[PDB]
Swiss-Prot record, chains A, B:
Record organism: Azotobacter vinelandii (strain DJ / ATCC BAA-1303)
Keywords: 2Fe-2S, Electron transport, Iron, Iron-sulfur, Metal-binding, Nitrogen fixation, Transport
Gene Ontology molecular function terms on file: 2 iron, 2 sulfur cluster binding; metal ion binding
GO biological process, alphabetically ordered: nitrogen fixation
Subunit structure: Homodimer.
Amino-acid positions noted as binding [2Fe-2S] cluster in the UniProt annotation, renumbered to this chain: C8, C21, C53, C57
The protein's name: Ferredoxin, 2Fe-2s
Cofactor: [2Fe-2S] cluster
Cofactor binding comment, as recorded: Binds 1 [2Fe-2S] cluster.
Function: Ferredoxins are iron-sulfur proteins that transfer electrons in a wide variety of metabolic reactions. Might be involved in nitrogen fixation.
Recorded family membership: Belongs to the 2Fe2S Shethna-type ferredoxin family.
InterPro entries: Fdxn_Azotob-type, Thioredoxin-like_sf
Length: 104, 104
């Protein structure tokens, strides 16, 4: 792996006070990433893995990338290509969805 | 996080042809790490997270460490402290349980 994409997929019961990335659209986000990776022939260069809780649940859905420990928050399906294209390939973190520096 | 410890926790049904790190003692491995981390006051420095399948199921229980993409295979509870101390604190990957280079 040149890159490792970690998608928080922790579920908690509906109405849990922490919420959960699972309830915030992790499944749609994972699929957007995988669709992008398959499309661009990247599935042998970039690993895509679900995780439990990554810590900042209220900023979900959360995505962490290694190398770098770069986290993204409030992630939506449309960002998957943006992150792959501009950060992973282009070398520039997508500042619009970077987890705030105070939180991570 | 200085280090991120990823513990494959994928379960598959009993008798699944792939097996699962779940069936290979992932939970015993995760608990050993957690106990070493809490005991050495490292839970703010080193993140510990469960993951879906990391790929090489036949070599499980599998742990991956970032920075570095260093995977350990056939992991047992006793290795936790070894990896934390030798590798994560001491800088020397623990040669005895490193995932064969062919595989990862
Ligand atoms: S549930 Fe996703 S970061 Fe906590
Ligand atoms: S189930 Fe753990 S590596 Fe596949």
């Amino acid at each position: 792996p040149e890159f490792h994409i970690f998608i928080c997929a922790q579920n908690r019961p509906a109405g849990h006070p922490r919420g959960s990335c699972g309830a915030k659209g992790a499944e749609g986000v994972y699929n957007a990433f995988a669709q992008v990776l398959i499309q661009k022939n990247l599935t042998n260069r970039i690993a895509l893995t679900t995780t439990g809780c990554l810590g900042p649940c209220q900023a979900g859905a959360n995505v962490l990338i290694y190398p770098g420990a770069v986290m993204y928050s409030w992630v939506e399906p449309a960002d998957a290509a943006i992150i792959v294209e501009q950060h992973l390939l282009g070398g520039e973190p997508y500042a619009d969805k970077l987890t705030p520096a105070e939180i991570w």
